[PDB]
Point group: D2
């Protein structure tokens, strides 16, 4: 197993991409801290799937944008399993608005979760990360295709791309790798809830996807396993677009 | 003259890159709104430079991260000159800190000015922008070279890069252009005050700059004039690295 | 004038983008060597346009893929005007073919002109260049959007992009700047002759162009003048996409 | 296993990166066509290492820059194993020269092998490729870092990057994936023979490598296995820099 004996944290693993990543890491032997914000039921369902398949996982509720919660998410890994090897910064929210319609709350909610939450959780985790550890930030293909009416959200993911590059260099001497995955449109709880599935944006994106379908959470999960594993030992500071060819 | 009859706003034009951009735009015929935050005297010096050279300019105090001040900056253009053609989002602050040392205040001050202030000032300006308008965002070469210990600052400029691309697509149908300049290290009031001139970072940047010197504010100002002018009429969504070849 | 007393070579200036660049450089005071391959009549017409407008120019026939012709083009600058300041590597050809249909002739004709010709002309020219010289390579937005059935042509322009970056670093110590322009679809003699204007690809590109039209040669010419001038003194190794926002 | 039942061609598998890729693909169950140009003994040793580990392989001599040899390499897969699933275009040569030292042979040798050979081998292969096939082009991090005195070699790899993007779009409807790996400096027989090991470039590269060593063939081979496998099913048109963090 590619991650035998390792411990991973996946933020926002009660739904969507994060849930798929948690299950996939556990399938390769990692014990997984499954973080949720509002959906304990979703996280418990993911933990039960992992444990019924023979793996180890534990649920932890916490808002990554709150310093004490980010710390407690990380402490859960150390207290439960004694070590930390892999951090997947997946928690994230998205809302579109044209420039005229942007409000302060629309801006702060997305930047606080999608950027400050990445920084706070990584800051808490790095004390426990040693040579060969792997930090995986879930960014978005919007940093390449920058759709209209996404200035705030695409802004958050542009920040994540740059933070990924900074920390790859900053943590290089400690041999901690830092990489991003930039998904295309993925069918998730969130893209249904946001009305993105079924929208004109979805139709446009689908038509421009070379491989001819929308993405699924497991399309991202298998790339996260790769980046978490030693097979990516010589990759750091990369941004892997996983969109079926759209960029 | 390239900008005869046009009106420009330069945020943060009491010092540094913004002051040089303001003077260069006025040299090509633009009437310039010269924004300051803490230094009225600096803005008055730039306005005096412009008017002594035969141009038109007016100072306005305002914090771009405050919605009411962003509105007052834009209203100054309309009240004084009756139109708005060019917006240069130059106001910005920088402070480095390694991941372990990042504080909430360090994060919020830079994102509020460097990202929210771009969004607020652009939001106020767009009501007045018509076909041929040009929005120029001052980003940074850090989105290319992502230096260690710059996670927050590089994050803000990654966000600006993405916002530039979004708004180029979003405002395209109105024939409003949106582009970024990504300066390398420029000798400015701010890089002196921040201790960056004389720092290890300065040494590293100089040692990797193909054209063999640090940048000066006029190195950026002449590119801003280009992007503001009809010479750049077929460029939108670009990010021009102006760093003497460092990328 | 921006290029007063300067001397420029434009390869492939009997038609299209190169003709527009030659006229624009001359409008800013440059004496221009107007190169043609098959159309002396076209180069002579561009020379007449330049001299009727008060400028200086001379035509020279030569195939940039032949070392002796590249040398003769450069010798024409030195022998006629005594110096060389600006080299625009604009000569290029394009033909689409899906992978199954690519022939050796289709491959060699495009790489010999579009790549070897850039190398040979730059190699002859660099001996005469000094501080402040500007080399401008005309690449293509296809290095961003890589359309189907363009493997050979996009291949040539990907080479040109890389050669631009190499020579920017290699000639940095001599303070010779090297930059690329990457045009979008431009209506020219060539794109009419190739049937590209009116194609389904043109409809797709137009629909994806934020500024809502196809490009024209003067859209590129004004950017070439900027890069040739001291206004771009702090830019080297850049690739300026000039496509109305398509990338 | 990840490639059970599948068949791969690795061009240039008698040495270096290609040898390591061939052995790694076979470890995951692929039958491997091991192509060599000058070194039958090297290919035979790779084939033997593969069969000793329980796999299937066959050696074939051929110059990818010769159409008849490229066709025979592909025919070897079909005649020996009946199918083709993975093509690794790894064959490549490198020689540095500053612009004034570039000769016609130096240019043609590298473009014929590194670009035309990729096109010819891919052209022969595509007839046999169906849904789920994976084409992996070995490019180079020089397309990011474009070192001085590498205009021809970096030019070839810039062409490979662009060809990768074209064919990803062109072959997307057939659900054939096309991706590139862009290695940093890898210790191989070729870098020994080229005077790269022990050069000033090796010192420059190693000092700018965040993860603190030179690369090894298996650093690339594990990424090739990922791209060949269904784990990369949602990635096409990507360029994976595998350089220990240098870009
Ligand atoms: N098409 C796409 O789906 C797409 C494309 C590109 C990038 N992305 C990125 O992929 C990531 C996941 O997207 P998704 O579509 O899977 O989202 P989703 O279905 O809406 O799931 C979001 C997950 O993040 C959690 N979360 C949200 N805010 C949080 C906070 N403050 N603290 C902790 N956890 C928080 C949610 O927790 P609860 O549900 O328990 O509250 C949930 O587990 C995000 O970073 C998103 O930006 C998605
Ligand atoms: N090497 C560099 O200098 C460098 C490199 C890359 C990018 N940049 C970017 O270039 C821009 C200018 O940098 P600089 O070095 O010229 O800076 P500077 O010398 O420190 O000048 C900063 C200017 O921004 C104004 N400003 C700051 N906060 C503001 C706020 N909240 N509202 C309105 N105006 C505000 C300042 O006003 P007062 O002084 O009146 O308070 C001043 O006019 C920034 O966006 C920076 O990130 C700089
Ligand atoms: N949409 C576009 O038009 C477009 C988009 C992106 C990039 N580009 C690039 O822009 C450049 C100009 O394109 P264009 O559309 O203006 O082409 P064009 O109208 O066909 O004109 C091509 C010019 O190049 C010259 N030329 C061709 N082969 C030559 C050779 N071997 N030696 C010397 N000169 C040679 C031609 O000379 P003669 O006519 O006298 O033989 C002519 O002056 C090319 O590099 C092209 O790849 C064009
Ligand atoms: N640092 C690096 O090593 C580095 C970095 C980035 C990219 N790359 C790329 O990685 C690839 C492999 O490099 P390497 O260092 O492993 O090279 P290497 O050790 O020199 O091995 C080259 C291989 O290519 C074969 N080859 C050469 N010309 C050929 C032709 N015309 N037809 C068929 N096969 C041919 C050789 O065959 P014979 O030996 O049997 O003649 C050999 O098997 C190349 O594409 C190179 O550009 C290498
Ligand atoms: O536009 C796309 O291709 C994906 C949009 C998706 C949901 O907003 C995201 O990037 O998070
Ligand atoms: O890294 C450089 O060369 C530039 C640093 C400069 C001041 O922090 C900035 O990007 O604002
Ligand atoms: O596809 C586009 O956007 C431009 C195509 C054009 C002619 O082939 C060129 O790149 O030279
Ligand atoms: O410059 C590097 O980091 C790698 C050089 C290597 C051999 O020339 C190549 O790209 O093929
Ligand atoms: Ca884009
Ligand atoms: Ca970089
Ligand atoms: Ca693309
Ligand atoms: Ca570079
Ligand atoms: Na304080
Ligand atoms: Na660019
Ligand atoms: Na990449």
């Amino acid at each position: 197993s590619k991650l035998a004996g390792k411990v991973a944290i996946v933020t926002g693993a009660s739904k969507g991409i994060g849930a798929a990543i948690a299950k996939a890491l556990a399938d390769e032997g990692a014990a997984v801290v499954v973080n949720y914000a509002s959906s304990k039921a979703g996280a418990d369902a993911v933990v039960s799937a992992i444990t019924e398949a023979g793996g180890r996982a534990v649920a932890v509720g916490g808002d990554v944008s709150k310093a004490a919660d980010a710390q407690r998410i990380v402490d859960t890994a150390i207290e439960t399993y004694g070590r930390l090897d892999v951090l997947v910064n997946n928690s994230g929210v998205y809302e579109f608005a044209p420039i005229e319609a942007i409000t302060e709350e629309h801006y702060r909610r997305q930047f606080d979760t999608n950027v400050f939450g990445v920084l706070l959780t990584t800051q808490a985790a790095v004390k426990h990360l040693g040579e060969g550890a792997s930090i995986i930030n879930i960014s978005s293909v919007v940093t390449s295709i920058t759709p209209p009416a996404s200035a705030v959200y695409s802004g958050t993911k542009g920040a994540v791309d740059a933070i990924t590059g900074v920390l790859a260099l900053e943590l290089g001497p400690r041999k901690i790798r830092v990489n991003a995955i930039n998904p295309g449109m993925i069918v998730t709880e969130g893209t249904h809830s946001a009305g993105i599935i079924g929208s004109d944006l979805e139709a446009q994106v689908l038509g421009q996807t070379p491989l001819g379908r929308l993405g699924e959470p497991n399309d991202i999960a298998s790339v996260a396993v790769f980046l978490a594993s030693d097979d990516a030992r010589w990759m750091t500071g990369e941004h892997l677009v996983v969109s079926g060819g759209l960029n």
